[PDB]
Amino acid sequence: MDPLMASVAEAVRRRAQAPLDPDAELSALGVTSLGVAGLIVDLEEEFSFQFPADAVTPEVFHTLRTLTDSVRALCRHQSSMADTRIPAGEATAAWQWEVSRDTGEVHALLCACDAHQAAASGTSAPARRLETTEHRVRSGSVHLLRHDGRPAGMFTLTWDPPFAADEGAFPPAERPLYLSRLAVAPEWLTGGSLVGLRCLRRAIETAAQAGGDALRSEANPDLSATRSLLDILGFVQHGPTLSDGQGRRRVHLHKSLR
Ligand SMILES: [Cl-]
């Protein structure tokens, strides 16, 4: 095979669940959302480049051909193929990021995602304060991804810790930022939409552009899919797993930046 495409094909078969055609769809190979996350981390390690959040789309990860072409383009740019790096068409442009200004919209999205993931994991949905949503939205901390006008995913990014955590729960850092309320609309939680992966990468990029040297988070490890996602993208757990008298748990995660 062609060398770059051969490397990409090996990376893909690592994250597949089936026994290679350049025009084969990754989804048909059984590559899931977590699969794509591991694929991105492998390729970034192998070829010493960084995947942009807006390249985390089912269009880039459609087939082995599209993925290989995107890898080639991204590698070239981070050192001509601008036609590939800038994808033409209305489907790409249907996805738009904003700093949210609509409290009710944010709170409805958060609660829908919470309830869905609680049903899927067998855990209690967290209690969300509308006053917290109001404070976050007025602060400019909520970043929301729309598709065709309808909210799809979001994250909250603050200088203040949005959760209690002792000293030493995290490695030291000069300007840490905090991630909370990462949420995806139920319709995109099919396990292959990549919306959550895209929002998480966007939070990493935004925190890095803000001058942060660390991104801190509190995660429920019993939401095992998101826990794995955080782990694949390099969030390291510092200190032991906290747990209540009724078995509900939380862990503190730290990811280095810039
Ligand atoms: Cl998944």
Side-chain angles (χ1 to χ4, degrees), residues 1-257:
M1 216 181 207
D2 173 83
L4 178 68
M5 163 139 40
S7 304
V8 178
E10 272 189 26
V12 165
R13 74 107 181 283
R14 214 182 322 295
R15 311 294 176 172
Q17 300 154 347
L20 190 36
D21 183 9
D23 284 38
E25 296 200 28
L26 300 205
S27 67
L29 267 300
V31 178
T32 69
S33 184
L34 298 168
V36 172
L39 181 53
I40 285 154
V41 167
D42 287 334
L43 293 179
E44 291 179 328
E45 185 265 318
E46 177 160 7
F47 297 109
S48 302
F49 79 101
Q50 210 210 124
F51 250 97
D54 56 1
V56 190
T57 66
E59 285 67 355
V60 164
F61 291 86
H62 183 205
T63 76
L64 181 45
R65 176 101 264 163
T66 72
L67 179 55
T68 304
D69 288 351
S70 301
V71 174
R72 186 173 276 111
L74 290 175
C75 274
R76 257 202 55 91
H77 186 248
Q78 312 176 9
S79 58
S80 68
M81 229 182 312
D83 169 72
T84 303
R85 189 229 321 157
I86 296 114
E90 301 182 332
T92 298
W95 299 86
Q96 295 295 314
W97 279 100
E98 79 193 48
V99 168
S100 178
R101 26 176 48 171
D102 190 329
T103 289
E105 207 171 31
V106 176
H107 201 83
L109 170 62
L110 177 61
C111 289
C113 175
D114 278 335
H116 187 284
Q117 301 301 65
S121 50
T123 65
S124 301
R128 304 299 190 175
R129 289 177 75 252
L130 186 58
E131 298 85 345
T132 295
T133 306
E134 181 65 27
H135 173 53
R136 295 309 174 213
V137 166
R138 297 297 141 249
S139 292
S141 314
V142 182
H143 300 266
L144 187 141
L145 172 65
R146 295 186 192 276
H147 175 73
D148 286 321
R150 151 154 50 165
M154 75 174 175
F155 66 84
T156 297
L157 184 71
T158 52
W159 298 105
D160 290 359
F163 49 77
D166 304 333
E167 270 296 18
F170 298 96
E174 309 314 299
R175 278 218 103 182
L177 284 147
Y178 289 92
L179 174 70
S180 54
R181 295 192 158 196
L182 177 73
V184 175
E187 74 189 276
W188 302 109
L189 292 172
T190 62
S193 83
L194 306 186
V195 172
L197 177 47
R198 190 176 182 170
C199 296
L200 191 48
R201 295 288 274 203
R202 177 69 166 207
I204 296 165
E205 295 172 0
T206 311
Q209 282 157 27
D213 59 346
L215 187 51
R216 296 166 169 175
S217 147
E218 186 184 63
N220 186 336
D222 296 309
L223 308 202
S224 43
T226 309
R227 183 58 190 96
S228 294
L229 178 57
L230 291 151
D231 181 58
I232 286 155
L233 296 184
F235 288 79
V236 183
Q237 180 183 322
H238 200 244
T241 290
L242 282 51
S243 35
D244 293 9
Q246 288 199 330
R248 300 182 215 86
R249 308 194 285 184
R250 65 201 47 97
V251 297
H252 300 134
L253 302 178
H254 170 287
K255 178 177 175 52
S256 289
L257 302 170

